[PDB]
Design a protein around this nucleic acid. Structure first.
Lengths: 129, 66, 271, 104, 70, 88
RNA sequence: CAAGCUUGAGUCUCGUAGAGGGGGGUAGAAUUCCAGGUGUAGCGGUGAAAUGCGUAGAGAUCUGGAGGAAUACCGGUGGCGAAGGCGGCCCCCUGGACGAAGACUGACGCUCAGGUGCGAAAGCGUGGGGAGCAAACAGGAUUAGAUACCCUGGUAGUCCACGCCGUAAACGAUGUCGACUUGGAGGUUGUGCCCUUGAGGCGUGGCUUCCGGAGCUAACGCGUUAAGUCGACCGCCUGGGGA
RNA sequence: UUCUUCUAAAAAAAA
């Protein structure tokens, strides 16, 4: 059965980039739209949009620069089989700080650098670079 | 080029000996589907009808059994 | 239903009973009982004419209807009963006019079933008709040898015969021994096999079980002395001769049928 | 109930007994609250191969709707009737009533 | 395969017609097939191999139809 | 399988709205009815394993539904097992 | 923890295809045996022979009868089943799958150590049945030898009822469930629209075969039915021999 | 149509 919608979202993004798709569509969720918002303000996806009322569908407009895809490595970190939680002083720097790590803190979900600035840790949802 | 799908007949009737004789050889054997061009579903129905007729002694099993 | 006894003692360790829950758990029908006195295997001259018989539990004779002549009058089966006189079980049936009789029990007979004899009876297990109206290939039992004499063939626990052919006034039956025999088409017979088919599966377990049925022990010929049997004698175990009966006739293969009167009805001998 | 198509072949020497056999079987069916949707005596016909060392047989077709508890005993009556040579009892999805292709 | 010789017909053409009828009806192949016992695994493998060849030859012809040899 | 009339009768007896055909009580009743109807069949044909697999599928499905019902509303579960005579 | 929602999962109405399973009948071809008619010196078998079958009449041919097993043609990298596996026809009981329109319950779901059930063929027990085939065995050949390959016979077994055994290269050498990622030619099975202006055209589902793009792979290859990109659970591996 | 087997020691280049 489908037991990890966030991983499914990351997988749709990765496959669409590999297959040179302009946009991808998936069933929405408040956490998916939140990660999508983080990616848009960090310049990984062009724009996100959610339509529908009873079964809302989120559509992500992918981004391409110089022919090739922008996101070249995206992976789920805390997966249902093994959860990962890290304190603020030991947060990881993905690709020496050039990449980002989507971390879910108490004050919403934000990037690792923002979490370090704000001084609080949380659950590490995924790395994206 | 299946005659049964052309007429759009629901099911092949085993009592229709006149049409059934056109799909058997002189030896009494069944002519293959790839030769006569009949569709597979009607071919199975046709086979069932031919066997039912043979049981009912309306058609010969072989050309030699007397 | 066969059940295996638990080994709580030797003599019971190997017993396998054949229980039948349908049999009457009471006394047999009084107007049909009659005396059956033992003989000890001794004829009217008082000499033992067949050894290893004697003793055993007392038994009474049940008058079983073998002739089956009540034609046209249907009968309902009152109950199944055990019969010590034969291997098969018997059934107490009640005719419409109020006469009760004993018949052999077929394979599928249960309490409440309807049976009938005669030329116009239905073809179903337990009915008795003359075998010229009975379809060829059918397995029948309690079959007569002469018209009106009563059943003599296929009478044990789980036996039957097959009517394999019919040619004019005679039919050819495949007897239970594997032998093809002719018989007249006017003899009656009952449809279907006879009931207690699992009777051969039982094992007696101990010597006393065979003693209860009036079967005295059997002494092997080689264990005797030369005056008693041809095989007797020898310092040790010696058997240097061809096996023969106590009166000198060979047993291992030698045929003994000498009835030329009935040879004309045996189409083919057993195998 | 269930729809059955019965077709039986009876010995040609009993060709005069076939009306009476038709009456008895139809009487049984109706008495068992059944319907007879079609009944076509095809009469005698030449067999494609000799059955029981005879080369002709009297065919009869009958389309009936009846309970299986009367249909099975009808099969037994066929089994025990020596006059009838064969009988095919096929079960069909719906009642069919059109004339068979061997009446023309 | 019954062949009844018609009036004003040579024996040799009658024999040829009988031979043609026989190879049409497939009696020689059937008897040679049933001469010895063939295991279910062997006949399945043989039919599978036959289908593979019957498809491969068609594809091979299709590829060969494009290119030239000189 | 079950007859159309039998299913109609069962859904009328157990359905809250008489047209639903999907409620847990109705589904459990249908499965129970089919199992009891198949009791006679498997008593005669003891070697029909291919149908016994489907029967076990029905049994496991009914077990899961009863567990779900007992977790959701104990009262309906109790009433249903009382009406159907199920020991657990 | 409480209240929900319908997309996952399931139920109902109308149908469709199928060697899916269990029980009971029945039809035809052929092999063997038995009895009879015709007929005479060979038959059978092999690379060549011989054992064997024949003047006590074989083989061949015709007629009648008995018995057991399996269903030519259809038949198809065709169909159904979770796997093992299932092939004449008819009836009874019965499981699963798929399609079109809705309606309904409302996460009820996926996997599963231990446990339970099913599980080819051979084998075992009890009781039947035994035509053909055929471990063991005997005889005849080949050979230096031939406890084999080849030939003539032939017993357990193969068949039926009920239990036991629980193993296979039990294989797709690829565990189950779900999501995403270019395509082509077919097979099989529903179903919607356009004039079915004939067997026409345009879609949309289920199962399945071959080729191939990116990608993966030690390579061969796999390639929307993945061995690609991911998530959940289980079983298993740590040099070869010993094992 | 049959046609078996050959034990036990080698050497190889390095801009």
């Amino acid at each position: 059965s489908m037991q990890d919608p966030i991983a499914d979202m990351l997988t749709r993004i990765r496959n669409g980039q590999a297959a040179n798709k302009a946009a991808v569509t998936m069933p929405s969720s408040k956490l998916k739209v939140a990660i999508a918002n983080v990616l848009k303000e960090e310049g990984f996806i062009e724009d996100f949009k959610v339509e529908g009322d009873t079964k809302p569908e989120l559509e992500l407009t992918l981004k391409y620069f110089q022919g090739k895809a922008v996101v070249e490595s995206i992976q789920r970190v805390s997966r249902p089989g093994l959860r990962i939680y890290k304190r603020k002083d030991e947060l990881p720097k993905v690709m020496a700080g050039l990449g980002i790590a989507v971390v879910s803190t108490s004050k919403g979900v934000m990037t690792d650098r923002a979490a370090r600035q704000a001084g609080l840790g949380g659950e590490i949802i995924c790395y994206v670079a | 080029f299946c005659r049964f799908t052309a007429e759009g007949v629901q099911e092949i009737d085993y009592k229709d000996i006149a049409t059934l004789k056109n799909y058997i050889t002189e030896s009494g054997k069944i002519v293959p589907s790839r030769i006569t061009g009949t569709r597979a579903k009607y071919q199975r129905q046709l086979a069932r009808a031919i066997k039912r007729a043979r049981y009912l002694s309306l058609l010969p099993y072989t050309d030699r059994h007397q | 239903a066969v059940v295996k006894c638990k080994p709580t003692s030797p003599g019971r360790r190997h017993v396998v009973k054949v229980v039948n829950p349908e049999l009457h758990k009471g006394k047999p029908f009084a107007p049909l009982l009659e005396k059956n006195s033992k003989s000890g295997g001794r004829n009217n001259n008082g000499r033992i004419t067949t050894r290893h018989i004697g003793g055993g539990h007392k038994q009474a004779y049940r008058i079983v209807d073998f002739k089956r002549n009540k034609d046209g009058i249907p009968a309902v089966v009152e109950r199944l009963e055990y019969d010590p006189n034969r291997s098969a079980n018997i059934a107490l049936v009640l005719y419409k006019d109020g006469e009760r009789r004993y018949i052999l029990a077929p394979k599928g007979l249960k309490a409440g079933d309807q049976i009938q004899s005669g030329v116009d009876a239905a073809i179903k297990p337990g009915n008795t008709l003359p075998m010229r109206n009975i379809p060829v290939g059918s397995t029948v039992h309690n079959v007569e040898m002469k018209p009106g004499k009563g059943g003599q063939l296929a009478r044990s626990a789980g036996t039957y015969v097959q009517i394999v052919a019919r040619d004019g006034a005679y039919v050819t039956l495949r007897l239970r021994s594997g032998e093809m025999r002719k018989v007249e088409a006017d003899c009656r017979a009952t449809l279907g096999e006879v009931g207690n088919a699992e009777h051969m599966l039982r094992v007696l377990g101990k010597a006393g079980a065979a003693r209860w049925r009036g079967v005295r022990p059997t002494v092997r010929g080689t264990a005797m002395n030369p005056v008693d049997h041809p095989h007797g004698g020898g310092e040790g175990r010696n058997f240097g001769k061809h096996p023969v009966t106590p009166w000198g006739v060979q047993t291992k293969g030698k045929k003994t049928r000498s009835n030329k009167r009935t040879d004309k009805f045996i189409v083919r001998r057993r195998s | 109930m269930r729809h059955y198509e019965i077709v039986f072949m009876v010995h040609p020497d009993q060709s005069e007994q076939v009306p009476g056999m038709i009456e008895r079987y139809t009487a049984a069916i109706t008495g068992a609250e059944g319907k007879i949707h079609r009944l076509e005596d095809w009469g005698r016909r030449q067999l494609a191969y000799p059955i029981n060392k005879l080369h002709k047989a009297h065919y009869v077709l009958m389309n009936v709707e009846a309970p299986q508890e009367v249909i099975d005993e009808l099969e037994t009556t066929f089994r025990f009737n020596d006059a009838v040579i064969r009988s095919m009892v096929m079960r069909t999805k719906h009642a069919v009533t059109e004339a068979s292709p061997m009446v023309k | 395969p019954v062949i009844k010789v018609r009036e004003n017909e040579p024996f040799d053409v009658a024999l040829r017609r009988f031979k043609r009828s026989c190879e049409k009806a497939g009696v020689l192949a059937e008897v040679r097939r049933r001469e010895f016992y063939e295991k279910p695994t062997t006949e399945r493998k043989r039919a599978k191999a036959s289908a593979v060849k019957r498809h491969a030859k068609k594809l091979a012809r299709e590829n060969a139809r494009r290119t030239r040899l000189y | 399988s079950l007859s159309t009339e039998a299913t109609a009768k069962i859904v009328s007896e157990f359905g809250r709205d008489a047209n639903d055909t999907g409620s847990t009580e109705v589904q459990v009743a249908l499965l129970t009815a089919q199992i009891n109807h198949l009791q006679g069949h498997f008593a005669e044909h003891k070697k029909d394993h291919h149908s016994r697999r489907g029967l076990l599928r029905m049994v496991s499905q009914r077990r899961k539904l009863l567990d779900y019902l007992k977790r959701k509303d104990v009262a309906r579960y109790t009433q249903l097992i009382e009406r159907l005579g199920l020991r657990r």
